[PDB]
Amino acid sequence: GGGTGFPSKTTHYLQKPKEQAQKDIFAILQRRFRNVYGKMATVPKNVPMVLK
RNA sequence: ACGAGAACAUGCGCGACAUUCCGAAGAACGCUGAAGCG
């Protein structure tokens, strides 16, 4: 379904090492959504932040 | 007062008969209405 989350709808997170995948996802989210992740200085413990 | 004088290169006759512009051919191949959450 729709609204399952960022891990879902994205093959790359599973393939990348947890830390590498988290960094790449944070970079992508900051590139797209600058008003939430763009304001965040560092990578959060979990990327994306919220559970869907 | 000419190898001359008359004297239609003419008459009847259909460019016509038989013919399929057809034969073969997927508008389809891939494509999450989804991501962030303020």
mmCIF file of N, CA and C (backbone and C1' of nucleotides) in Angstrom:
data_model
loop_
_atom_site.group_PDB
_atom_site.id
_atom_site.type_symbol
_atom_site.label_atom_id
_atom_site.label_comp_id
_atom_site.label_asym_id
_atom_site.label_seq_id
_atom_site.Cartn_x
_atom_site.Cartn_y
_atom_site.Cartn_z
ATOM 1 N N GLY A 1 0.773 -1.260 0.000
ATOM 2 C CA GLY A 1 0.000 0.000 0.000
ATOM 3 C C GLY A 1 0.790 1.289 0.000
ATOM 4 N N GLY A 2 0.085 2.419 -0.113
ATOM 5 C CA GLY A 2 0.715 3.752 -0.049
ATOM 6 C C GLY A 2 0.852 4.206 1.392
ATOM 7 N N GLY A 3 1.909 4.957 1.711
ATOM 8 C CA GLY A 3 2.157 5.401 3.097
ATOM 9 C C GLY A 3 2.872 4.359 3.937
ATOM 10 N N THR A 4 3.332 3.256 3.336
ATOM 11 C CA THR A 4 4.119 2.265 4.105
ATOM 12 C C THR A 4 5.414 2.871 4.604
ATOM 13 N N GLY A 5 6.127 3.648 3.778
ATOM 14 C CA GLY A 5 7.310 4.383 4.275
ATOM 15 C C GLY A 5 8.426 4.535 3.256
ATOM 16 N N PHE A 6 9.505 5.252 3.605
ATOM 17 C CA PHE A 6 10.711 5.388 2.733
ATOM 18 C C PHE A 6 11.451 4.052 2.547
ATOM 19 N N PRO A 7 11.711 3.208 3.583
ATOM 20 C CA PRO A 7 12.347 1.922 3.351
ATOM 21 C C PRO A 7 11.575 1.249 2.239
ATOM 22 N N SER A 8 10.248 1.200 2.367
ATOM 23 C CA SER A 8 9.398 0.649 1.280
ATOM 24 C C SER A 8 9.423 1.614 0.088
ATOM 25 N N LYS A 9 9.285 1.109 -1.140
ATOM 26 C CA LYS A 9 9.259 1.954 -2.370
ATOM 27 C C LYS A 9 10.715 2.257 -2.740
ATOM 28 N N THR A 10 11.686 1.756 -1.952
ATOM 29 C CA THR A 10 13.132 2.010 -2.225
ATOM 30 C C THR A 10 13.978 0.761 -2.019
ATOM 31 N N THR A 11 14.462 0.149 -3.101
ATOM 32 C CA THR A 11 15.358 -1.040 -3.053
ATOM 33 C C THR A 11 16.692 -0.721 -2.400
ATOM 34 N N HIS A 12 17.244 0.477 -2.606
ATOM 35 C CA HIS A 12 18.640 0.807 -2.191
ATOM 36 C C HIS A 12 18.898 0.677 -0.686
ATOM 37 N N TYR A 13 17.954 1.029 0.185
ATOM 38 C CA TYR A 13 18.300 1.016 1.627
ATOM 39 C C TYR A 13 18.711 -0.388 2.013
ATOM 40 N N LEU A 14 17.991 -1.399 1.535
ATOM 41 C CA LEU A 14 18.335 -2.768 1.985
ATOM 42 C C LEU A 14 19.753 -3.121 1.515
ATOM 43 N N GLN A 15 20.088 -2.787 0.264
ATOM 44 C CA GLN A 15 21.415 -3.156 -0.298
ATOM 45 C C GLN A 15 22.580 -2.469 0.427
ATOM 46 N N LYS A 16 22.446 -1.176 0.730
ATOM 47 C CA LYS A 16 23.570 -0.409 1.337
ATOM 48 C C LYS A 16 23.790 -0.799 2.808
ATOM 49 N N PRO A 17 25.038 -0.756 3.330
ATOM 50 C CA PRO A 17 25.281 -1.009 4.745
ATOM 51 C C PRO A 17 24.419 -0.071 5.564
ATOM 52 N N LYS A 18 23.944 -0.523 6.726
ATOM 53 C CA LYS A 18 23.005 0.294 7.491
ATOM 54 C C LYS A 18 23.470 1.741 7.600
ATOM 55 N N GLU A 19 24.738 1.959 7.951
ATOM 56 C CA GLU A 19 25.227 3.327 8.112
ATOM 57 C C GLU A 19 25.357 4.036 6.767
ATOM 58 N N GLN A 20 25.892 3.342 5.757
ATOM 59 C CA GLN A 20 25.999 3.929 4.425
ATOM 60 C C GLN A 20 24.624 4.230 3.842
ATOM 61 N N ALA A 21 23.684 3.292 3.993
ATOM 62 C CA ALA A 21 22.325 3.522 3.515
ATOM 63 C C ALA A 21 21.678 4.689 4.244
ATOM 64 N N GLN A 22 21.875 4.778 5.563
ATOM 65 C CA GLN A 22 21.318 5.897 6.315
ATOM 66 C C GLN A 22 21.878 7.222 5.822
ATOM 67 N N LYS A 23 23.188 7.279 5.573
ATOM 68 C CA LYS A 23 23.785 8.520 5.089
ATOM 69 C C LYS A 23 23.250 8.895 3.710
ATOM 70 N N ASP A 24 23.134 7.917 2.807
ATOM 71 C CA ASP A 24 22.628 8.216 1.469
ATOM 72 C C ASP A 24 21.168 8.655 1.508
ATOM 73 N N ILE A 25 20.354 7.998 2.337
ATOM 74 C CA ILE A 25 18.953 8.380 2.468
ATOM 75 C C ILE A 25 18.835 9.780 3.054
ATOM 76 N N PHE A 26 19.667 10.100 4.049
ATOM 77 C CA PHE A 26 19.650 11.444 4.614
ATOM 78 C C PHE A 26 20.023 12.480 3.563
ATOM 79 N N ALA A 27 21.025 12.172 2.735
ATOM 80 C CA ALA A 27 21.400 13.093 1.667
ATOM 81 C C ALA A 27 20.247 13.305 0.693
ATOM 82 N N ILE A 28 19.575 12.222 0.295
ATOM 83 C CA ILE A 28 18.469 12.341 -0.654
ATOM 84 C C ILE A 28 17.325 13.147 -0.047
ATOM 85 N N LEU A 29 16.966 12.844 1.202
ATOM 86 C CA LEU A 29 15.861 13.542 1.849
ATOM 87 C C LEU A 29 16.173 15.020 2.033
ATOM 88 N N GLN A 30 17.418 15.351 2.388
ATOM 89 C CA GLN A 30 17.804 16.753 2.487
ATOM 90 C C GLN A 30 17.749 17.433 1.126
ATOM 91 N N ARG A 31 18.152 16.724 0.069
ATOM 92 C CA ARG A 31 18.070 17.293 -1.273
ATOM 93 C C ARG A 31 16.626 17.586 -1.661
ATOM 94 N N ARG A 32 15.705 16.683 -1.323
ATOM 95 C CA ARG A 32 14.308 16.859 -1.706
ATOM 96 C C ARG A 32 13.556 17.735 -0.709
ATOM 97 N N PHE A 33 13.507 17.314 0.551
ATOM 98 C CA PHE A 33 12.734 17.988 1.592
ATOM 99 C C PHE A 33 13.699 18.787 2.465
ATOM 100 N N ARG A 34 13.967 20.029 2.056
ATOM 101 C CA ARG A 34 14.896 20.880 2.786
ATOM 102 C C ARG A 34 14.279 21.506 4.029
ATOM 103 N N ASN A 35 12.950 21.501 4.146
ATOM 104 C CA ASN A 35 12.313 22.144 5.289
ATOM 105 C C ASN A 35 12.305 21.262 6.530
ATOM 106 N N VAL A 36 12.562 19.962 6.386
ATOM 107 C CA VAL A 36 12.582 19.069 7.540
ATOM 108 C C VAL A 36 13.975 18.485 7.720
ATOM 109 N N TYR A 37 14.444 17.731 6.724
ATOM 110 C CA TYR A 37 15.757 17.103 6.832
ATOM 111 C C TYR A 37 16.866 18.073 6.454
ATOM 112 N N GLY A 38 16.549 19.078 5.635
ATOM 113 C CA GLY A 38 17.530 20.102 5.326
ATOM 114 C C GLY A 38 17.934 20.915 6.539
ATOM 115 N N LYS A 39 16.996 21.151 7.457
ATOM 116 C CA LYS A 39 17.324 21.882 8.675
ATOM 117 C C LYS A 39 18.099 21.016 9.660
ATOM 118 N N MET A 40 18.016 19.695 9.521
ATOM 119 C CA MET A 40 18.737 18.802 10.418
ATOM 120 C C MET A 40 20.227 18.830 10.106
ATOM 121 N N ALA A 41 21.042 19.037 11.141
ATOM 122 C CA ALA A 41 22.481 19.159 10.940
ATOM 123 C C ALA A 41 23.139 17.808 10.685
ATOM 124 N N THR A 42 22.744 16.780 11.428
ATOM 125 C CA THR A 42 23.393 15.481 11.371
ATOM 126 C C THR A 42 22.390 14.394 11.005
ATOM 127 N N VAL A 43 22.925 13.232 10.648
ATOM 128 C CA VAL A 43 22.078 12.080 10.328
ATOM 129 C C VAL A 43 21.390 11.595 11.596
ATOM 130 N N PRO A 44 20.070 11.431 11.601
ATOM 131 C CA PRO A 44 19.394 10.924 12.798
ATOM 132 C C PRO A 44 19.721 9.459 13.037
ATOM 133 N N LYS A 45 19.330 8.966 14.215
ATOM 134 C CA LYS A 45 19.581 7.540 14.545
ATOM 135 C C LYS A 45 18.927 6.674 13.465
ATOM 136 N N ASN A 46 17.720 7.054 13.039
ATOM 137 C CA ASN A 46 17.017 6.299 12.012
ATOM 138 C C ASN A 46 16.585 7.245 10.901
ATOM 139 N N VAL A 47 16.793 6.827 9.656
ATOM 140 C CA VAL A 47 16.363 7.593 8.488
ATOM 141 C C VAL A 47 15.468 6.696 7.639
ATOM 142 N N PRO A 48 14.209 7.078 7.378
ATOM 143 C CA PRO A 48 13.524 8.315 7.786
ATOM 144 C C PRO A 48 13.192 8.341 9.274
ATOM 145 N N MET A 49 12.910 9.527 9.821
ATOM 146 C CA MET A 49 12.771 9.663 11.268
ATOM 147 C C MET A 49 11.531 8.951 11.796
ATOM 148 N N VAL A 50 10.397 9.096 11.115
ATOM 149 C CA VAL A 50 9.098 8.734 11.672
ATOM 150 C C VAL A 50 8.671 7.379 11.122
ATOM 151 N N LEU A 51 7.952 6.616 11.944
ATOM 152 C CA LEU A 51 7.365 5.363 11.490
ATOM 153 C C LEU A 51 6.060 5.636 10.756
ATOM 154 N N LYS A 52 5.827 4.889 9.684
ATOM 155 C CA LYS A 52 4.633 5.080 8.875
ATOM 156 C C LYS A 52 3.595 3.998 9.149
ATOM 157 O "O5'" A B 1 3.431 27.278 -129.031
ATOM 158 C "C5'" A B 1 2.817 25.970 -129.122
ATOM 159 C "C4'" A B 1 1.941 25.745 -127.916
ATOM 160 C "C3'" A B 1 1.193 24.407 -127.872
ATOM 161 O "O3'" A B 1 1.089 23.933 -126.538
ATOM 162 C "C1'" A B 1 -0.367 26.181 -127.909
ATOM 163 P P C B 2 2.050 22.768 -125.999
ATOM 164 O "O5'" C B 2 1.963 22.992 -124.407
ATOM 165 C "C5'" C B 2 2.392 21.928 -123.525
ATOM 166 C "C4'" C B 2 3.857 22.083 -123.213
ATOM 167 C "C3'" C B 2 4.385 21.177 -122.095
ATOM 168 O "O3'" C B 2 5.769 20.893 -122.250
ATOM 169 C "C1'" C B 2 4.500 23.413 -121.395
ATOM 170 P P G B 3 6.299 19.845 -123.347
ATOM 171 O "O5'" G B 3 5.577 18.467 -122.925
ATOM 172 C "C5'" G B 3 6.109 17.711 -121.809
ATOM 173 C "C4'" G B 3 5.127 16.628 -121.436
ATOM 174 C "C3'" G B 3 5.562 15.661 -120.322
ATOM 175 O "O3'" G B 3 4.610 15.567 -119.269
ATOM 176 C "C1'" G B 3 4.681 14.480 -122.174
ATOM 177 P P A B 4 4.126 16.855 -118.441
ATOM 178 O "O5'" A B 4 2.893 17.424 -119.304
ATOM 179 C "C5'" A B 4 2.892 18.817 -119.687
ATOM 180 C "C4'" A B 4 1.638 19.102 -120.473
ATOM 181 C "C3'" A B 4 0.329 18.853 -119.720
ATOM 182 O "O3'" A B 4 -0.041 20.009 -118.978
ATOM 183 C "C1'" A B 4 0.258 17.797 -121.854
ATOM 184 P P G B 5 -0.876 19.882 -117.611
ATOM 185 O "O5'" G B 5 -2.382 19.608 -118.114
ATOM 186 C "C5'" G B 5 -3.063 20.633 -118.879
ATOM 187 C "C4'" G B 5 -4.432 20.129 -119.260
ATOM 188 C "C3'" G B 5 -5.224 19.455 -118.135
ATOM 189 O "O3'" G B 5 -5.967 20.391 -117.366
ATOM 190 C "C1'" G B 5 -5.213 18.058 -120.039
ATOM 191 P P A B 6 -5.648 20.583 -115.806
ATOM 192 O "O5'" A B 6 -5.570 19.045 -115.324
ATOM 193 C "C5'" A B 6 -6.415 18.590 -114.238
ATOM 194 C "C4'" A B 6 -7.825 18.376 -114.732
ATOM 195 C "C3'" A B 6 -8.626 17.281 -114.017
ATOM 196 O "O3'" A B 6 -9.498 17.851 -113.050
ATOM 197 C "C1'" A B 6 -8.446 16.764 -116.328
ATOM 198 P P A B 7 -9.054 18.002 -111.514
ATOM 199 O "O5'" A B 7 -8.945 16.474 -111.047
ATOM 200 C "C5'" A B 7 -10.087 15.608 -111.210
ATOM 201 C "C4'" A B 7 -9.608 14.190 -111.054
ATOM 202 C "C3'" A B 7 -8.855 13.901 -109.744
ATOM 203 O "O3'" A B 7 -9.518 12.944 -108.927
ATOM 204 C "C1'" A B 7 -7.720 12.991 -111.643
ATOM 205 P P C B 8 -10.218 13.381 -107.548
ATOM 206 O "O5'" C B 8 -9.086 13.331 -106.389
ATOM 207 C "C5'" C B 8 -8.057 14.358 -106.349
ATOM 208 C "C4'" C B 8 -7.571 14.580 -104.934
ATOM 209 C "C3'" C B 8 -6.912 13.385 -104.229
ATOM 210 O "O3'" C B 8 -5.902 13.818 -103.330
ATOM 211 C "C1'" C B 8 -8.822 14.036 -103.022
ATOM 212 P P A B 9 -4.367 13.908 -103.792
ATOM 213 O "O5'" A B 9 -3.667 12.791 -102.864
ATOM 214 C "C5'" A B 9 -3.998 11.402 -103.084
ATOM 215 C "C4'" A B 9 -4.345 10.737 -101.778
ATOM 216 C "C3'" A B 9 -3.331 10.932 -100.639
ATOM 217 O "O3'" A B 9 -3.904 11.544 -99.480
ATOM 218 C "C1'" A B 9 -3.667 8.575 -101.108
ATOM 219 P P U B 10 -5.126 10.944 -98.621
ATOM 220 O "O5'" U B 10 -6.455 10.954 -99.532
ATOM 221 C "C5'" U B 10 -7.736 10.874 -98.861
ATOM 222 C "C4'" U B 10 -8.654 9.929 -99.596
ATOM 223 C "C3'" U B 10 -9.411 8.927 -98.718
ATOM 224 O "O3'" U B 10 -10.516 9.495 -98.025
ATOM 225 C "C1'" U B 10 -8.553 7.825 -100.613
ATOM 226 P P G B 11 -11.081 8.788 -96.698
ATOM 227 O "O5'" G B 11 -11.820 7.453 -97.203
ATOM 228 C "C5'" G B 11 -13.057 7.555 -97.943
ATOM 229 C "C4'" G B 11 -13.645 6.173 -98.043
ATOM 230 C "C3'" G B 11 -13.659 5.381 -96.734
ATOM 231 O "O3'" G B 11 -14.832 5.692 -95.995
ATOM 232 C "C1'" G B 11 -12.725 4.056 -98.469
ATOM 233 P P C B 12 -14.770 5.913 -94.407
ATOM 234 O "O5'" C B 12 -14.782 4.417 -93.836
ATOM 235 C "C5'" C B 12 -16.001 3.653 -93.953
ATOM 236 C "C4'" C B 12 -15.694 2.210 -93.660
ATOM 237 C "C3'" C B 12 -14.991 1.923 -92.328
ATOM 238 O "O3'" C B 12 -15.864 1.860 -91.205
ATOM 239 C "C1'" C B 12 -13.913 0.749 -94.078
ATOM 240 P P G B 13 -15.979 3.067 -90.147
ATOM 241 O "O5'" G B 13 -14.621 3.102 -89.278
ATOM 242 C "C5'" G B 13 -14.451 2.175 -88.172
ATOM 243 C "C4'" G B 13 -13.780 0.927 -88.683
ATOM 244 C "C3'" G B 13 -12.712 0.279 -87.799
ATOM 245 O "O3'" G B 13 -13.173 -0.651 -86.824
ATOM 246 C "C1'" G B 13 -12.040 0.311 -90.112
ATOM 247 P P C B 14 -13.983 -0.260 -85.488
ATOM 248 O "O5'" C B 14 -13.377 1.089 -84.838
ATOM 249 C "C5'" C B 14 -12.206 0.992 -83.994
ATOM 250 C "C4'" C B 14 -12.139 2.187 -83.076
ATOM 251 C "C3'" C B 14 -10.929 2.228 -82.139
ATOM 252 O "O3'" C B 14 -10.653 3.552 -81.705
ATOM 253 C "C1'" C B 14 -12.878 1.685 -80.906
ATOM 254 P P G B 15 -9.185 4.195 -81.850
ATOM 255 O "O5'" G B 15 -8.641 4.423 -80.352
ATOM 256 C "C5'" G B 15 -7.231 4.206 -80.101
ATOM 257 C "C4'" G B 15 -7.080 2.874 -79.413
ATOM 258 C "C3'" G B 15 -7.015 2.914 -77.879
ATOM 259 O "O3'" G B 15 -7.965 1.989 -77.376
ATOM 260 C "C1'" G B 15 -5.419 1.466 -78.731
ATOM 261 P P A B 16 -8.638 2.144 -75.924
ATOM 262 O "O5'" A B 16 -9.342 0.713 -75.748
ATOM 263 C "C5'" A B 16 -10.365 0.331 -76.694
ATOM 264 C "C4'" A B 16 -10.258 -1.148 -76.955
ATOM 265 C "C3'" A B 16 -10.013 -2.025 -75.725
ATOM 266 O "O3'" A B 16 -11.214 -2.272 -74.998
ATOM 267 C "C1'" A B 16 -8.571 -2.676 -77.498
ATOM 268 P P C B 17 -11.199 -2.833 -73.489
ATOM 269 O "O5'" C B 17 -10.845 -4.393 -73.601
ATOM 270 C "C5'" C B 17 -11.791 -5.290 -74.223
ATOM 271 C "C4'" C B 17 -11.157 -6.655 -74.282
ATOM 272 C "C3'" C B 17 -10.603 -7.166 -72.949
ATOM 273 O "O3'" C B 17 -11.660 -7.728 -72.182
ATOM 274 C "C1'" C B 17 -8.999 -7.485 -74.675
ATOM 275 P P A B 18 -11.828 -7.359 -70.629
ATOM 276 O "O5'" A B 18 -10.762 -8.346 -69.951
ATOM 277 C "C5'" A B 18 -11.026 -9.766 -69.994
ATOM 278 C "C4'" A B 18 -9.871 -10.492 -69.357
ATOM 279 C "C3'" A B 18 -9.360 -9.888 -68.045
ATOM 280 O "O3'" A B 18 -10.062 -10.421 -66.930
ATOM 281 C "C1'" A B 18 -7.538 -10.281 -69.531
ATOM 282 P P U B 19 -11.098 -9.524 -66.095
ATOM 283 O "O5'" U B 19 -10.307 -9.248 -64.730
ATOM 284 C "C5'" U B 19 -9.228 -8.297 -64.760
ATOM 285 C "C4'" U B 19 -7.963 -8.948 -64.267
ATOM 286 C "C3'" U B 19 -7.364 -8.298 -63.014
ATOM 287 O "O3'" U B 19 -6.635 -9.197 -62.187
ATOM 288 C "C1'" U B 19 -5.912 -7.966 -64.852
ATOM 289 P P U B 20 -7.275 -9.767 -60.829
ATOM 290 O "O5'" U B 20 -7.944 -8.462 -60.161
ATOM 291 C "C5'" U B 20 -7.090 -7.451 -59.571
ATOM 292 C "C4'" U B 20 -7.948 -6.422 -58.877
ATOM 293 C "C3'" U B 20 -7.204 -5.439 -57.972
ATOM 294 O "O3'" U B 20 -8.004 -4.286 -57.751
ATOM 295 C "C1'" U B 20 -8.338 -7.049 -56.658
ATOM 296 P P C B 21 -7.372 -2.822 -57.924
ATOM 297 O "O5'" C B 21 -6.805 -2.449 -56.460
ATOM 298 C "C5'" C B 21 -5.856 -1.361 -56.323
ATOM 299 C "C4'" C B 21 -4.511 -1.957 -55.995
ATOM 300 C "C3'" C B 21 -4.208 -2.224 -54.519
ATOM 301 O "O3'" C B 21 -4.912 -3.353 -54.025
ATOM 302 C "C1'" C B 21 -2.259 -1.640 -55.798
ATOM 303 P P C B 22 -6.121 -3.186 -52.982
ATOM 304 O "O5'" C B 22 -6.273 -4.703 -52.491
ATOM 305 C "C5'" C B 22 -5.326 -5.182 -51.520
ATOM 306 C "C4'" C B 22 -4.617 -6.404 -52.039
ATOM 307 C "C3'" C B 22 -3.833 -7.171 -50.969
ATOM 308 O "O3'" C B 22 -4.688 -8.108 -50.329
ATOM 309 C "C1'" C B 22 -2.429 -6.735 -52.832
ATOM 310 P P G B 23 -4.490 -8.477 -48.780
ATOM 311 O "O5'" G B 23 -3.103 -9.293 -48.797
ATOM 312 C "C5'" G B 23 -3.033 -10.535 -49.539
ATOM 313 C "C4'" G B 23 -1.646 -11.103 -49.393
ATOM 314 C "C3'" G B 23 -1.029 -10.956 -48.002
ATOM 315 O "O3'" G B 23 -1.520 -11.986 -47.158
ATOM 316 C "C1'" G B 23 0.532 -10.281 -49.631
ATOM 317 P P A B 24 -2.201 -11.607 -45.758
ATOM 318 O "O5'" A B 24 -0.922 -11.570 -44.801
ATOM 319 C "C5'" A B 24 -0.092 -12.747 -44.731
ATOM 320 C "C4'" A B 24 1.201 -12.361 -44.067
ATOM 321 C "C3'" A B 24 1.061 -11.435 -42.858
ATOM 322 O "O3'" A B 24 0.696 -12.193 -41.713
ATOM 323 C "C1'" A B 24 2.806 -10.677 -44.285
ATOM 324 P P A B 25 -0.443 -11.680 -40.704
ATOM 325 O "O5'" A B 25 0.309 -10.496 -39.926
ATOM 326 C "C5'" A B 25 1.506 -10.827 -39.183
ATOM 327 C "C4'" A B 25 2.324 -9.577 -38.994
ATOM 328 C "C3'" A B 25 1.806 -8.593 -37.934
ATOM 329 O "O3'" A B 25 2.722 -8.423 -36.862
ATOM 330 C "C1'" A B 25 2.511 -7.479 -39.919
ATOM 331 P P G B 26 2.516 -9.141 -35.437
ATOM 332 O "O5'" G B 26 1.127 -8.581 -34.840
ATOM 333 C "C5'" G B 26 1.055 -7.201 -34.413
ATOM 334 C "C4'" G B 26 -0.289 -6.940 -33.780
ATOM 335 C "C3'" G B 26 -0.500 -5.520 -33.245
ATOM 336 O "O3'" G B 26 -1.851 -5.094 -33.343
ATOM 337 C "C1'" G B 26 -0.600 -7.057 -31.456
ATOM 338 P P A B 27 -2.241 -3.735 -34.108
ATOM 339 O "O5'" A B 27 -1.470 -2.550 -33.314
ATOM 340 C "C5'" A B 27 -2.188 -1.819 -32.286
ATOM 341 C "C4'" A B 27 -1.235 -1.350 -31.213
ATOM 342 C "C3'" A B 27 -1.883 -0.596 -30.037
ATOM 343 O "O3'" A B 27 -1.388 -0.897 -28.740
ATOM 344 C "C1'" A B 27 -0.056 0.588 -30.836
ATOM 345 P P A B 28 -1.372 -2.382 -28.134
ATOM 346 O "O5'" A B 28 0.094 -2.869 -28.576
ATOM 347 C "C5'" A B 28 0.503 -4.219 -28.265
ATOM 348 C "C4'" A B 28 1.856 -4.199 -27.603
ATOM 349 C "C3'" A B 28 1.834 -4.047 -26.074
ATOM 350 O "O3'" A B 28 2.828 -4.927 -25.565
ATOM 351 C "C1'" A B 28 3.152 -2.360 -27.017
ATOM 352 P P C B 29 3.021 -5.222 -23.994
ATOM 353 O "O5'" C B 29 4.580 -5.615 -23.996
ATOM 354 C "C5'" C B 29 5.439 -4.965 -24.960
ATOM 355 C "C4'" C B 29 6.684 -4.469 -24.273
ATOM 356 C "C3'" C B 29 6.502 -3.963 -22.838
ATOM 357 O "O3'" C B 29 6.510 -5.047 -21.918
ATOM 358 C "C1'" C B 29 7.836 -2.439 -24.091
ATOM 359 P P G B 30 5.877 -4.902 -20.450
ATOM 360 O "O5'" G B 30 6.869 -3.908 -19.676
ATOM 361 C "C5'" G B 30 8.176 -4.397 -19.295
ATOM 362 C "C4'" G B 30 8.985 -3.243 -18.766
ATOM 363 C "C3'" G B 30 8.340 -2.461 -17.620
ATOM 364 O "O3'" G B 30 8.619 -3.089 -16.376
ATOM 365 C "C1'" G B 30 9.232 -0.968 -19.260
ATOM 366 P P C B 31 7.482 -3.228 -15.252
ATOM 367 O "O5'" C B 31 7.145 -1.697 -14.887
ATOM 368 C "C5'" C B 31 8.175 -0.900 -14.259
ATOM 369 C "C4'" C B 31 7.784 0.556 -14.290
ATOM 370 C "C3'" C B 31 6.579 0.953 -13.417
ATOM 371 O "O3'" C B 31 6.989 1.745 -12.307
ATOM 372 C "C1'" C B 31 6.579 2.055 -15.537
ATOM 373 P P U B 32 7.243 1.104 -10.853
ATOM 374 O "O5'" U B 32 5.772 0.770 -10.281
ATOM 375 C "C5'" U B 32 4.961 1.849 -9.761
ATOM 376 C "C4'" U B 32 3.651 1.289 -9.266
ATOM 377 C "C3'" U B 32 2.741 2.261 -8.505
ATOM 378 O "O3'" U B 32 1.378 1.857 -8.530
ATOM 379 C "C1'" U B 32 3.599 0.656 -7.007
ATOM 380 P P G B 33 0.402 2.245 -9.745
ATOM 381 O "O5'" G B 33 0.011 3.786 -9.492
ATOM 382 C "C5'" G B 33 -0.972 4.098 -8.476
ATOM 383 C "C4'" G B 33 -0.344 5.023 -7.466
ATOM 384 C "C3'" G B 33 -0.971 5.047 -6.062
ATOM 385 O "O3'" G B 33 0.074 4.787 -5.137
ATOM 386 C "C1'" G B 33 -0.465 7.198 -6.795
ATOM 387 P P A B 34 -0.197 4.374 -3.610
ATOM 388 O "O5'" A B 34 1.208 4.903 -3.023
ATOM 389 C "C5'" A B 34 2.426 4.327 -3.551
ATOM 390 C "C4'" A B 34 3.481 5.394 -3.694
ATOM 391 C "C3'" A B 34 3.796 6.209 -2.438
ATOM 392 O "O3'" A B 34 4.621 5.502 -1.517
ATOM 393 C "C1'" A B 34 3.758 7.599 -4.381
ATOM 394 P P A B 35 4.814 5.999 0.002
ATOM 395 O "O5'" A B 35 5.939 7.150 -0.041
ATOM 396 C "C5'" A B 35 7.295 6.812 -0.418
ATOM 397 C "C4'" A B 35 8.124 8.067 -0.343
ATOM 398 C "C3'" A B 35 7.932 8.890 0.933
ATOM 399 O "O3'" A B 35 8.717 8.378 2.003
ATOM 400 C "C1'" A B 35 7.742 10.303 -0.946
ATOM 401 P P G B 36 8.172 8.490 3.509
ATOM 402 O "O5'" G B 36 8.518 10.014 3.883
ATOM 403 C "C5'" G B 36 9.901 10.440 3.831
ATOM 404 C "C4'" G B 36 9.944 11.934 4.016
ATOM 405 C "C3'" G B 36 9.233 12.456 5.266
ATOM 406 O "O3'" G B 36 10.109 12.415 6.385
ATOM 407 C "C1'" G B 36 8.514 13.680 3.362
ATOM 408 P P C B 37 9.675 11.630 7.715
ATOM 409 O "O5'" C B 37 8.567 12.642 8.289
ATOM 410 C "C5'" C B 37 9.011 13.975 8.640
ATOM 411 C "C4'" C B 37 7.856 14.943 8.561
ATOM 412 C "C3'" C B 37 6.929 14.988 9.788
ATOM 413 O "O3'" C B 37 7.055 16.230 10.468
ATOM 414 C "C1'" C B 37 5.721 15.108 7.725
ATOM 415 P P G B 38 8.177 16.467 11.592
ATOM 416 O "O5'" G B 38 8.433 18.053 11.463
ATOM 417 C "C5'" G B 38 7.347 18.962 11.762
ATOM 418 C "C4'" G B 38 6.749 19.488 10.480
ATOM 419 C "C3'" G B 38 5.907 20.762 10.626
ATOM 420 O "O3'" G B 38 6.685 21.922 10.357
ATOM 421 C "C1'" G B 38 4.606 19.059 9.616
#
